[PDB]
């Protein structure tokens, strides 16, 4: 049994606010979290509740999934796919170190169109 590392309630409850939502546990730790307390975006929120929202610590790359440098890892808070900013297709050096979307989301982004 997990819960938001920020309220420790239970998704349908934001305990610290007693309001409903939907946590996100780490597919490694189990540490759940409300995307509201996580500052996530919808797409993230929706993507992280279904697949492995490896807690930001286990987050690592997706282009490596090793954490390697983790000083470049770009955390797509649109699902949680970190990419050492020099792993991306348009690799950055600093630019969107935190936010920024990933490629799976993008190809899926463009796919969302039409």
């Amino acid at each position: 049994g997990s819960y938001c590392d920020f309220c420790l309630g239970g998704s349908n409850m934001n305990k610290k606010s007693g309001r409903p939502e939907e946590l996100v546990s780490c597919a490694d730790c189990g540490r759940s979290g409300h995307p509201t307390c996580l500052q996530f975006t919808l797409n993230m929120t929706e993507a992280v509740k279904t697949y492995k929202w490896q807690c930001i610590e286990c987050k690592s790359c997706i282009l490596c999934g090793t954490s390697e440098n983790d000083d470049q890892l770009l955390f797509c808070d649109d699902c949680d796919r970190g990419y050492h900013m020099y792993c991306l297709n348009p690799p950055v050096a600093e630019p969107p170190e935190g936010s920024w979307s990933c490629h799976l989301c993008w190809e899926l982004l463009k796919e969302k169109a039409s």
């Binding site: 307390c37 954490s67 955390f75 170190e97």
Partner: peptide, 20 residues
């Protein structure tokens, strides 16, 4: 988010979050 327990951190502000 913003990584759990494991130290004190590396930042002293409030900008950006979630990394490790």
């Amino acid at each position: 988010s913003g990584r759990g327990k494991g130290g004190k951190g590396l930042g002293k502000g409030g900008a950006k979050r979630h990394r490790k």
